[PDB]
Amino acid sequence: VETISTGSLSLDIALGAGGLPMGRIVEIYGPESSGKTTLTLQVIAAAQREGKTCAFIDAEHALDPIYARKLGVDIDNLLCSQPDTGEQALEICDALARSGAVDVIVVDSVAALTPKAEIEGEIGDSHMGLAARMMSQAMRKLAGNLKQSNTLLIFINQIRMKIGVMFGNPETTTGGNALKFYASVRLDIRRIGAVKEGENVVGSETRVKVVKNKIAAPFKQAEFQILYGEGINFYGELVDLGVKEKLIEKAGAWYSYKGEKIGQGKANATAWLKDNPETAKEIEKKVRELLLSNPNSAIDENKQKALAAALGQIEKQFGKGSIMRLGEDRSMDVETISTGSLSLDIALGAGGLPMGRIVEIYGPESSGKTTLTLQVIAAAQREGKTCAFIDAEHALDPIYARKLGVDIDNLLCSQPDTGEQALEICDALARSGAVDVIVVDSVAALTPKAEIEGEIGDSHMGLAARMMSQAMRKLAGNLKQSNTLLIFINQIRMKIGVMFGNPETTTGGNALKFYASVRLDIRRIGAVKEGENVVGSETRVKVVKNKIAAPFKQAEFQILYGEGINFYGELVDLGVKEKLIEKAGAWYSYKGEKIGQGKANATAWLKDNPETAKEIEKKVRELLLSNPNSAIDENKQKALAAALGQIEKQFGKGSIMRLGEDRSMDVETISTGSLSLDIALGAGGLPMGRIVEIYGPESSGKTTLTLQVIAAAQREGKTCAFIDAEHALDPIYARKLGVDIDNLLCSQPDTGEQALEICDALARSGAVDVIVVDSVAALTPKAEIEGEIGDSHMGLAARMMSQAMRKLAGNLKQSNTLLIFINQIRMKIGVMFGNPETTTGGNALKFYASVRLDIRRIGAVKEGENVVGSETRVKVVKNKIAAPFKQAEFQILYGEGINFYGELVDLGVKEKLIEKAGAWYSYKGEKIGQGKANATAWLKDNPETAKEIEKKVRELLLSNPNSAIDENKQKALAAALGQIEKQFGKGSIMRLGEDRSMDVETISTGSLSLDIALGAGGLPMGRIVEIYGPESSGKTTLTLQVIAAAQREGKTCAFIDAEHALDPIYARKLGVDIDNLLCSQPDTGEQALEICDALARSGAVDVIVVDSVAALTPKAEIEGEIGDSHMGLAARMMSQAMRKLAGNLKQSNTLLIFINQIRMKIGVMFGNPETTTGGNALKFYASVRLDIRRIGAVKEGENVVGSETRVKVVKNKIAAPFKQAEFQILYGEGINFYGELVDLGVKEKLIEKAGAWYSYKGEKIGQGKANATAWLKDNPETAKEIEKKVRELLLSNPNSAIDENKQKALAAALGQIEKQFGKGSIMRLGEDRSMDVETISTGSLSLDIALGAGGLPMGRIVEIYGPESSGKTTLTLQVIAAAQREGKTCAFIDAEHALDPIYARKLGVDIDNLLCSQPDTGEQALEICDALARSGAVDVIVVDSVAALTPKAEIEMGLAARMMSQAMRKLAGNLKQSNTLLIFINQIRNPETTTGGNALKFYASVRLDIRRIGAVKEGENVVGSETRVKVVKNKIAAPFKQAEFQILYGEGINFYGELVDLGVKEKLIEKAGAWYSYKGEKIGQGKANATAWLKDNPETAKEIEKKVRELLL
DNA sequence: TTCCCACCTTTT
DNA sequence: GGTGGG
């Protein structure tokens, strides 16, 4: 074995034998620009340095001779071939091997070794295994010839990814398995970092692994530097290796060799070794001796004789210049084209993009990819070059291309059907030699033929990637031989499951990374502003890959809309920077002469003096370019027309043509229904044949706007389709907005795939003009719908959307069909910069959309009292059709639509077309109205005049003006509708007007005034509704009332009590049929929602209510610990639930009500700080949102007998929103319905009110509202009559064998649920025993009375708060004492660290059995609670001071609050199932509050406010505290009762004291002044003595107590 | 023979 | 920050 140096010392060491072995095969593989070629050339250079002959087979067609020379290759003697086929490449190798005249041969990219059959055949031809088999054959033939000639053969390989592998690593190597085996050495090279010069990236930090070794031990590795333009930093290695081996001294920064100092810092030491090559050889020799594991140990004139013989043989076999010396190959010289940006041409090093090469530009949407592309075309055309544009993205605007200076009439342009076609066209143009630059707009849009013919949702694993990989092989060679530049535009996708590096990627696999000679990363970094206006994009381009000059330089410039790249702007900045232009403050001078003030003017001067500009530019280039550069056309046209004819004959009629004459490329628009929007849009409306996205917050106007464009389109005989994936379209409201319902095609699809397949069908039909998809958010993938709630479908919807765009874009353009996508907003999480908002369904749509609209409600349109509309603002966030970032403000008047004529007035007045004299509006002298209201009405009245004013406004304000047959359309329409219905079932698509299941049907809420506020007379069936509000506001109560009303009409209802606080007995009091109310107390939130879905699907339940989304605890959270972080889990779960539920609920006509709690959002000064639990999904999906609030107390002189209540209709999809209802909730009774009826009746003059006397139709019905209400209860027939009339008068939106099948399906679902979620996961409320409320004495009798139910409830959470030393702990201990007295087990969590065991004993606590913990962190405290709760072994737990519950992070902005909120979710369920009472003591921080957030207020079933009100005195001594407890919240009985008692220090609650007072109050004990008597017998004088008597007679005390309880409980 | 792709807040 | 499947 004999070796050759690799050019890297550390590699030669890693290789064991000191280099690569002669007569063997070697493979080097790695990622793009990793250093494969560079390393290769370095070994050649080293070999040539020793008189060896080398050959380079550049199959990759990317070798730069000048750079090879820079790396020290002798160009003039390096044999070099650029073969056509892979077989040719390998046949050349074999010939050179056999000749015995060549010492080292390298083949650059086996990846590029394209089989002959592949090159002859089309791109998209099944050459399965062909290249592998060829490689396998090559090895067999080569191995022997190489050994006998002692010729080293190096193969460079690229990396591909193996797909659907599940072990090791997914990387592979092109060209089969043969090479792995035959290689004696395999090298894995990788770039691991950048070599920096402060600012500059001057090299690549490199690592090579020896992956296979037949020559020495494998798996050693080498790290070194590749310095651009220099090569492997060899002396750098020598320094590091020398220092490591103690041959070179290193004293801090000082490097010494044998006493003599050689340099300071590695940089200088390296330079010294360059300077002393003799000393370098010496150190190197020693390093090798020390570190090489395997020791190495007339003639040449015969070689040349055989060399020339082989070269002659090769050329005679494979044509003219099939092999030659690199230095003399002219066709190898790198020639460049300007990019249109000067600073980019500088960044590129060589002054532009290289001819005959492939280039890729990628970046985010609207970053400038197309614009830049067109600019290079423009520049190329400016120099007589022919260019082609492949618009696969179907979004090129010819008029805009012209504005950028493209010669439209000579720009070849194609809009291909399939990706294969697109690339076959490229290959044809490449081969023709007639086109100079070709650009392909979006590889992302290069849709494989099979994908187009397949359905949406079909899986085509790696197809596009494999197609791209094939294209590169075929193109690379053809492009080089024709000297044709090919630019690929790519989009960015996000890769998922990546924490290191950056998550961005590029469409269409890995092939392009490798084949590209230049890769550009373009990004918009800011706006170019004109005070008000956004007139351009500030732009930055990074040179990410460069084979032509040093990479990683960058260029910043301006893209001025409608103008292009600001070239002269660059020239000014570059000129000033290079001291060619003088800058004295704001004054710019050139050679003494002043040229302008401010960059703006200096730029204008250079436009004016193009001769001077050329001069400055030339000098800037000379100064700053690192790689400077230095009958016929009639043959070209002959070959051009030949290719164009060939293409058209292959791919149909107008598959390729000149842009200027392509009619189907002209942009045509549709009105949006808003005039100011049409102006903002620049071109006067949305573009036909394009994709458009509208996004915004809930109820912002997305659907409304959508419908308005449909209405306008129908007004002009266009056919429209509406895909209501959100399942919330109201046909009657659509009609009100002027939509022709009877002709509006409408679909309510099951899956997202179905929705998009329908779009594609309608697109292809050519019969529909505008399609709108309502909510991509609601486009639920098929796998998700069939899967469970909580199932993970990573990137499924995104990948589905990405597929849809590919398929749709083309079909939409060819049919001239506009497609509008409505999207919702989600919050992205973990983002401090920019804004946290996003859009559902991935990144594809951002790119494909030609227009993106951000719509927002900015205010209310008021009618003094009434909210009659939404003040609206739309921003044009993306625009491919005109300049972006203009905005439109208008009004959406409910039930009417966009106020178009309102806009017309304002725009008319603004443009001085309409006169405004104060309040008087005049048009052409004639007065048209007073106040904007009337002027608007006048324009409605004079539509002819309106058209006239509109036309003028548009002329004045639009930048970008625009302006037998139908029987064929219907033929194709019916064909598509038939096809759709046969594919997706019975009524998958139909005309809106005839869809019955679309009609809105309502249920009474139990409040009349609410039913009125709701507009349509109640909540809508088959829809989702949300009620939110503060604690004890009436959310559950209201909920139960709707159930009660629904049951009253034979409807089946289910209650999901996730909050674990439903009192069956109270539900009965509210009139709920307990025995038939289905009821579940679910463990996890996923379970809760899976139950909903099951009941929805069953079609057997009519109304389902979920009590507290707040309490819907995700499974992972429940199984996790308290303090565990579950970022966005509940939100994401809710978001998933809505997608799955919406559809099932509509098809079953099931109403679903969600109760939500309020949390406070933090860091908010504007608006209001309130929010709702469980993310953003519900806001959007809810058809109605109710804000309920307690506004006062209903009093009975003394007693608080009810809550005065107000409900606001915060969102309404069913009628006008923002109406409100006030009513009374009478405790134990419910909503006072007849009370409302009286007030509404009197208000509507149906009931007479003469002072206090209420009359109905002459007959007096009662005195005072109280009696009138009672009369209506008594006469239900008359009540119905009055109610019916009130509804007729006040509802703005009025309504419209069998049941045995239902029960069959009901029992089926209940069985299914129980088999899925265990024993009693769902049952009838009336028979659920674990639902019964059971109580514990508080130790105070009067408190047990105040509490209504006689004590605190088991399995519930309770809070006691009050000032310091008020008796919180004492009371707590008293309940424990009482509980222990009855054999219950208790735990005390003393987080406050202040419990006195001896005092607890004095209060009668059994100390020895009281479990007690003093926790370190708050999380620990609550985790202990949860453990005890789950154990089912503890009966009462008390936590002393939530205030003292210190978060773990703190004992190292609302951190305790979030922890408490989490605790409640986890505890509530565990406590109920164990029947464990949990008491929280809280401190106080009216201005009073409670520590630890808002969660506890809600979850507590009882809240106690305890206070010391006085001292119990013994003349001198203070022997106790006089105490008062208020019942502030009560879910178990009526609230707001209070208890006063004594806390006697060292004794506890003065129980017998209470007994005296209660006894006297109830006339059981006589009180004659100071004398207390019981049953005639005197028991004491003064309360003090009477108390002592009852202690003495415990038997009598029991008797009195029993009676007091009977009387007062 | 060779990838594709995000989703979501939470709390004074 | 935890979540894979065609």
Ligand SMILES: Nc1ncnc2c1ncn2[C@@H]1O[C@H](COP(=O)(O)OP(=O)(O)O)[C@@H](O)[C@H]1O
């Ligand atoms: N002509 C050139 N001028 C300057 N730098 C170059 C040139 N060609 C390659 N490089 C640099 O060398 C490194 C590896 O290049 P190369 O060996 O061609 O990678 P590979 O062949 O592995 O794709 C890259 O960082 C690249 O920027």
Ligand SMILES: Nc1ncnc2c1ncn2[C@@H]1O[C@H](COP(=O)(O)OP(=O)(O)O)[C@@H](O)[C@H]1O
């Ligand atoms: N027809 C047009 N009129 C005005 N400005 C446009 C037009 N088309 C594109 N632009 C602007 O040029 C910039 C880049 O557009 P484009 O090159 O199409 O981006 P990409 O193709 O990279 O998605 C954007 O700021 C965009 O608003």
Ligand SMILES: Nc1ncnc2c1ncn2[C@@H]1O[C@H](COP(=O)(O)OP(=O)(O)O)[C@@H](O)[C@H]1O
């Ligand atoms: N059927 C209806 N009757 C009256 N007003 C409605 C109706 N539907 C929607 N609105 C009102 O129009 C505005 C926007 O409605 P919509 O277009 O449905 O919002 P989005 O679709 O953006 O969620 C809201 O303020 C809403 O209350």
Ligand SMILES: Nc1ncnc2c1ncn2[C@@H]1O[C@H](COP(=O)(O)OP(=O)(O)O)[C@@H](O)[C@H]1O
């Ligand atoms: N079992 C009950 N007995 C008496 N009053 C009750 C009962 N449950 C609730 N209330 C009262 O009804 C009002 C609303 O209670 P509820 O509907 O539970 O509120 P939330 O909105 O928190 O669910 C409160 O004043 C509450 O005290």
Ligand SMILES: Nc1ncnc2c1ncn2[C@@H]1O[C@H](COP(=O)(O)OP(=O)(O)O)[C@@H](O)[C@H]1O
């Ligand atoms: N160990 C004790 N000995 C005597 N008096 C006590 C003792 N502990 C508490 N008290 C008295 O009882 C009353 C309330 O105490 P406590 O229940 O601990 O208040 P807090 O509401 O702060 O927990 C106070 O007036 C206090 O002085």
Ligand code: ALF
């Ligand atoms: F193999 Al290369 F740039 F030459 F990725």
Ligand code: ALF
């Ligand atoms: F690639 Al684009 F707007 F054309 F993002």
Ligand code: ALF
């Ligand atoms: F998108 Al919506 F109400 F229809 F927020």
Ligand code: ALF
């Ligand atoms: F939601 Al509640 F009391 F039931 F605040």
Ligand code: ALF
């Ligand atoms: F003394 Al305290 F809560 F104020 F125990």
Ligand SMILES: [Mg+2]
């Ligand atoms: Mg290479």
Ligand SMILES: [Mg+2]
């Ligand atoms: Mg584009």
Ligand SMILES: [Mg+2]
């Ligand atoms: Mg909507």
Ligand SMILES: [Mg+2]
């Ligand atoms: Mg409740």
Ligand SMILES: [Mg+2]
């Ligand atoms: Mg205390």
